[model samples]
Target chain A: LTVPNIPLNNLANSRVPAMINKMTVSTDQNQVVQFQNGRCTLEGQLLGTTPVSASQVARIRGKVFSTASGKGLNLTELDGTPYHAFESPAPLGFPDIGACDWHVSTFKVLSGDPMSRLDVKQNAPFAPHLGSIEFTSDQDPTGDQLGTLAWVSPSTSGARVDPWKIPSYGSTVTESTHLAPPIFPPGFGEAIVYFMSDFPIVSGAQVPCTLPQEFVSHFVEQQAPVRGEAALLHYVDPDTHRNLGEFKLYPDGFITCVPNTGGGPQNLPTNGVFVFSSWVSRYYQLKPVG
Target chain B: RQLTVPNIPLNNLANSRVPAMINKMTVSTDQNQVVQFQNGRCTLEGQLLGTTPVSASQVARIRGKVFSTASGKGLNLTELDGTPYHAFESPAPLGFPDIGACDWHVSTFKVQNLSGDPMSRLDVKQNAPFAPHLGSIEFTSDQDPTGDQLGTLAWVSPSTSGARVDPWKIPSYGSTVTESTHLAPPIFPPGFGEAIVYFMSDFPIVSGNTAQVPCTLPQEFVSHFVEQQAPVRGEAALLHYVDPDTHRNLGEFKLYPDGFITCVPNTGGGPQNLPTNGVFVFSSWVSRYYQLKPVG
Candidate 1:
């Protein structure tokens, strides 16, 4: 899947124009389909143009679709022929299995084709109707806006994508499933952030690495107060800067790194990981949820 | 000395230590022996060859008083078995845990057994936890202080001159360039016996025209105290070093894979074999502690 063109850092106001047959259309104001940075803007006639915010950009998972209510952007394709705008306050679930799906890969002519329009919303076959996220906005007395998003899943018949184990399928734009591939943002998967070496393997030297800073921050922001989540970190030779293997950091902070069975650095040790999970909560500035 | 019971019986025995025996004799008449008084001298004579046992409650009162007095003087009372009263404290004269405004504060203690008649060995007061607090400053420890405690191990970014330097000292400590080379024993608290003193960068071993590197824990010290060299995590690892003869813990080191070594502020037990060798430290990865490049 090609990486989506969402903001890499903090995003400002983004405008998503209406589309008809993969071509951007104009609103009632007679505004022509404008051109910006990426290729082939959406074009349709007299649909709504919704304003996207930093909060919305952070919450975006799949390709943004137009909604008929002329309010917020829809993540899933609308359930109509020619893929009309989805309902506003988009249906509170994953894209329904076998819904009227338009293929984004061949939807238009662009540098990297649009994010893969999923056929079955491949999160997990057992629970296909999960992984829907909602962003609700309310206003303060001073006319400023405040927003919060929620994505809840049931304990039974549920699972999330393992970011580290994801295959090299380019981007979510090309994922075969309706749900996005790799729940985390870019710069994830097999990327090494920190390394430690210099000890002889005879004395049980375990190489240690840290997760990407953004990944750690995202985990804290989403699951604060409630501590710990399993994550996999990429390992590399400290001297040569070559990939050794991958290590799994458990929620309890116990690390397990298996060497490549087909011949690689066989001196990986596991003594280095400690029960130091509390450092995350202390270091990351977490505010009261109330 | 035989225990004799006098004939006179006192009424009030609340504050009296010896009254319990008299009251027991009065309650159990069969246990008492009556003797005739002669020449108005009332004496219950019994030639029993046994000494009176001290009351546990009476001894308990004395023990409480001793502990109270010691605590009042800010002393840490560790043991109370028998007359061997073990007590510990950081000596006042040394001005412990804080030597000067810029100087590093080491955890040291003065332990003594104040037993009467002949003092006994009170080795039980080892590894006592002591958190000293001043006006606005304080010291923290994960375990009891045996004079070994670790400071914050942080990754220092490269300097403006592009020299990768990492100091094994507290971030709030004074500059290492101005650190005094000559270290005397006065900084250590007196009566501490044999304490393992730690330093960030005491003496420069490698000196270039533009930069200098210091190595205090030399090869000799490493050979004796150092053991089980391995990383604990990415940022830090455990340094297992101890007394050469007794093999007791002198101290633990917070060893960074980057070669920066610092002592954990541990109030540990026994003596740490002092690092007595090493004229200077070297660059280019000579040892684990002296791994950083000299600052330009």
Candidate 2:
């Protein structure tokens, strides 16, 4: 089963303006909708109470729909027949699986400096129901901010991403079962895969995969007490249940995250990475009860 | 006349010559008247007859009457000179006899013994007075008349006029300077039969050129006497030669007599062999009356 291509211009012109209209209907609606985009964008409208300009609205409409065009159509309309049929494949697999491929990127934020937005949410996967969403802020964001992120996984306790099941041909799955690709801020430059159970899942067995951007950035910043560039991913394992690789961010814009075998989830043991900053208390966001 | 001689003897007529022989006698008387004759005898008549011879008494009467009758008429026979016959004799008529003669003579002389009697022993007195002299004499042995010729007598005078003379001669005396040797008679005083004499002629003089003499006899004289007799009485005479001025006797020699000679040897005993042929002397004592005579 394949997704139908809606003409690029049409979707670009039509759904982009419509999504914008829907985003502008109210500030609450705009926050919910813009926040749903699953992109870690720092748009001014989202950050401030000011109305977005027609130009900024247009520019954002264009960026959203432009990326959506490559998403393929989830529905189509018949011409003059007065019937409409969902022509887009129901379980729309990610176009190239590049996102699902567990792509990763990383950045370093100095201690007491703004945790780089690009570093905080880069290539993180999204959960459709907020129930599957979770994050741990190594640093606080709003008050005395240190670091923050969001992640989705089937197992709330284990950082495990379940295999996303695509429907059989012509079948439909609820939106709740649909997986969305993660988003990252611009300027996310480098990443590594520290763990993967089944990589390049083309056919056959599914290997678990990881986007090590968060884990690597965590390590790099945590290891900042050791001055100079260090690639932490070499201490992680990729194919096994271990965190095999982590990213290294150099003061010179050079980033590398390599995979190591052996160590599992407890890759970063105490004294594993030394950080220069003062230890701030670990805190969590309250999860919604079902 | 009738003649009568007194106390006359009658003559005998008978022997007359012839003519006278006739026996007849005649008587005649002339006196005046009477002639009577009786036988040729005459007869007188009474005229105081001549008295018959008278007795001494009668004679005494007659002589006394006659002598007594003439006192001054007798003779003056004694002459008038008062000189005694004894005074007319000489007193010691000699000067001190020559010293040699007086001393060397062996006269029989006498001297008083201790008992005041004369003894016959003899000793020769040395002739010289005590005076000083040059030399001395000594007897070394007893005189041996029968032995070797008696020791020689020699002397030295003041002028050295000296000689050897017989021992019986005068020995030159006085401070004899020369030595003398002489013979000694063996007959001497009893128990002493030999004697010797010494003559010192050149004896020291009183004030002459010779040394002053000492009074004491020299030892030589004493030694001479001792050699001769061995024992004798009286010490030998020492003729001391003395200076008359100082009266110092210078020297002397010994003289001895015959009866007092001795026979002891000059050096030891006996005279058979003289020891040194020197003179010997003898010595003895004499009583007052006894003369010293040479004894046999």
Candidate 3:
């Protein structure tokens, strides 16, 4: 069933904003170039899961995607210049250059027992509080990472096939073989939720709106290399007022979801919606504290 | 609401929770601290304490606040899935992302330049999960372009009058320390490739007296076990030019204590001015130099 387009931007009360993550590093050619005093920026898009009703999932928040979970991440540092730069498995766990029919949805806040609680991974840290900020989505609740719909990369060998292409002025880089994507709660498929809050947006959940609060949700309608966006859910963590982590939902592709995942060069989806990532300096600590 | 901050107490042994052993141990940061274990059983709830009281064999479980290593926080979810589930705990050999928090052990790290490979990388020296974290492996000498090699080591520490072992048998002295690989777009000399990474606990200076300078390089010729302590104020820790036939000293260095050695150079030359000879690395017997001929 061709998933219907739910004018994501016309969903009523959403605004647009930009976030930038600024960081520094000491660049001696032979030293471990460490990120000195890292900082984060808010403003973001898409989200996840499926197997039913043309399971639609595209969360475009904070420029993070999750068509599938980030199974393994490949990071590197060049001779000069720096980044979070370097390629890795698309959100689906691999370079999924293929296409998957993903469904899209609009959000509806709930005051009653939220029927669609986010079914989190069992051993996730603070598991009881994983999806407690209840909201109902049109996505099927039965999607598993690398399950039937999620495609794994054929080339898991982390090759330097430099997608960004290195000039003679190559993407020269170095990362201490003293590197790897993190002990990211090993089993979680693709992580789209930034629970702990530190520098940058410093956003997350806390006792479901104890009194009253206003959340500025950004909305996007551009293609890849698109600018700022708003979050999908403005819901709060029902139980804890200690600022629970915010979610970076991974709907279809891992980093690459939907029409964008299988599209052509510099070509963006003409009929695509923005998805998102839960950008946070820290991954899963429960509070806004790191 | 204000977030309630926990009252952190002064770190005293009185406030520690060590294993059954080290019942009478002391803790301090200035120097080193020691502890004693009682009746063979040296664990808390059964698991042995790693290095508190002293190094133990194993532990069923251990609890205590320890200094964080560049190594990552060892967390796992091997069982989070349904596929023929299994369990194993291993830290990712590479260290963690330095959100710029922990205080690192190694002080200053200096190097010539990287191997020039756009793919070259750095590592905070944690090869094994359970193994103790060592220094780092920023760059290596062998990483010098294709076949470019390290020049002679010019012995510098003049006071030690240390040993007269082989020319390459010193750590306190080497070539002068010049060259800056720390440029915007770092540029290298004709041959400048090395980092100061040191992971091998077995590598040493003196080889006892003037035996062999260790060559257990963990990564690029970058490790500086000896140079990390001694000179190079322009020299390579890897080689030196000496009185060729005599196996003499051409300005290199040697260790002091343990079992020192004088010398029998065919003909002692100036400082690190001798021709390069055989390499002293990789052989199973290389580390055995701690068993060589020497005394100060």
Candidate 4:
């Protein structure tokens, strides 16, 4: 499994203002962040004997900064070779991928008693704590595909729950609930969840909200890697918005990227041009109370 | 708010509950005919028995805090041959002696570094002060001197004038002190000096002579006996060589019952010379002259 080659031309023009504004205010009070015109919530619970499967969701939010003269930020690869140089714009978008700022949700379980019930009304809501994120396709059973829906959560603190116990409700349960949809393909078995409170949103800009220290400790203790779970939240071209039908709710707690059609390459941009910048989220094991 | 439990002593319980029993004595009918009958089928008879009825209880007399059946009578000094008839009674009012009376003597010998030369002289003094019941003298060397020649003190005649020569050459350098007697005065070689003496006693005594001497034995020669005891062996030999800066191998030597000898090296030889000092140790064990020879 490997990361599909996403052409720079087909990338979202993330520098646009509309894309930036959409990300900021799109999130609701309980929603940690919004991506792809969708809202996502974070939840946690102690593990139980039987694992509980919940739809996973996340939002990647970030600002753009550039290394262009008087407005640019230098970006380099691991070997120190310059990858891109750009300057901060009022709003940032893709096609100018200096540093594509964004967050990807981790797959997680949302079961357990009081701990599982998120205090959405509290001043400091602590349900969906930030967790280490990873994006990799090494274990993906699906063939290489370009849309990023891969991610994993930092496994710490939560109790170990069996994978079979997670409830896999049909499309009806997903549409009725506010929880984000599962990103995994139909046959996929288990998953983990991770969230970024302040994931990078724009090119060259740092993430806004810093991860909580507790979350950082969790990541350290678990030593989670970051690769497969990086959901690509890209900008959609205004012209192509009409080509793709209105996103519809599915029973699996997910809105099909392209409704009325099985999520496949044919529904995506065929000209190597990306059309939609959507919010991505994840869910994995749900624990039960004693 | 709780009351604490008190601890009980075990000794108290033992004393209150345990029964005491004394060692018993038995006598046959034939033995009872010699004495009159007493309580509990016991008889007061013969030398061990008296006119009074013999009680089953046997009480031991104390002398200086020590309990003994031979207290009070001078029979304590006599051999137990059952020759003189006497009654065993408690000595005075005290128990037996708690500590035994004893005396000890100390003798020191100077170790010589003969270099590779096999022959060396050991000067011993024979100035007897306190008479020791047992007397012994021993000689030790730096190496085993296994095959090396050895000789007893050559008795020079009073009429002779030249220095006496050592009869045997020591095979090895390392060896333990072997003891011998000087019943006859040693004939001193031309340059050699007279022998000095030291003594020890079974009972404590003071000496007036403080003359500087090599060594000494006691005047009262008990049975003179020598055993070819085994030599001391193993790790102890390594501890003897202590001086790191200057390694001097001529330290104290110990012997084991197995004929193995350990020569503790002294700290004198420089660090570089230290290793050489140990050579004497190997030589002593491997050499024949140093081996213990039983004297008839």
Per-candidate Cα lDDT values, in order, are 0.20, 0.18, 0.16, 0.17
TM-score, per-candidate, Cα-based: 0.15, 0.13, 0.15, 0.12
lDDT of 4 at A131: 10
**Global local distance difference test of model 3:** 0.16
Instruction: Give Cα distance to truth, residue A166, candidate 2, Å.
Output: 18
State interface RMSD in Å for all models: 42.7, 99.9, 29.8, 48.8
Q: Over the stretch B1-296, how does candidate 2's per-residue lDDT look in tens digits?
A: 22111110011111010001111111111111211110011111101111110010010000000011132111111100111211111110101111222111111101111111111111123433211111222111121111111100111123122322221122232334352211111222222322232111122121223211111111112112221223333343223322334544332223332211122223332222221112222122332223222211
TM-score for chain A, candidates 1 onward in order: 0.18, 0.18, 0.16, 0.17
- Worst lDDT run of 10 residues, candidate 4 chain A, spans A113-122
Please identify which of the two predictions, 1 or 2, would achieve the higher TM-score against the true structure: 1
- Please provide, for model 4 over B1-296, each residue's C-alpha lDDT reduced to its tens digit, 9 standing for 90 to 100: 11111011111000000010111111111211121111011110111111111110001111011012332100121101112212233111111111101111111111122222222222221223111112111223332322221121211111122322111111111112232211112212111110111111111111212101111110000000011112333322211322324544333332222111222112232112222212112223222223222110
Best-performing candidate as measured by lDDT: 1
Q: TM-score of chain B, per candidate?
A: 0.18, 0.15, 0.16, 0.16
Error of 2 at B124 (Å): 99
lDDT of 3 by residue, A122-221 (tens): 1212111111111122343322111111111111233212111101101222342211122122122222221111110011111000000001111111
Q: What is the lDDT of candidate 1?
A: 0.20
Error of 3 at A42 (Å): 24
Q: Which whole-number lDDT from 0 to 100 does residue A40 have in model 3?
A: 10
Candidate 2 share of real interface contacts? 0.00
Whichever of 1 and 4 has more lDDT, that candidate is 1
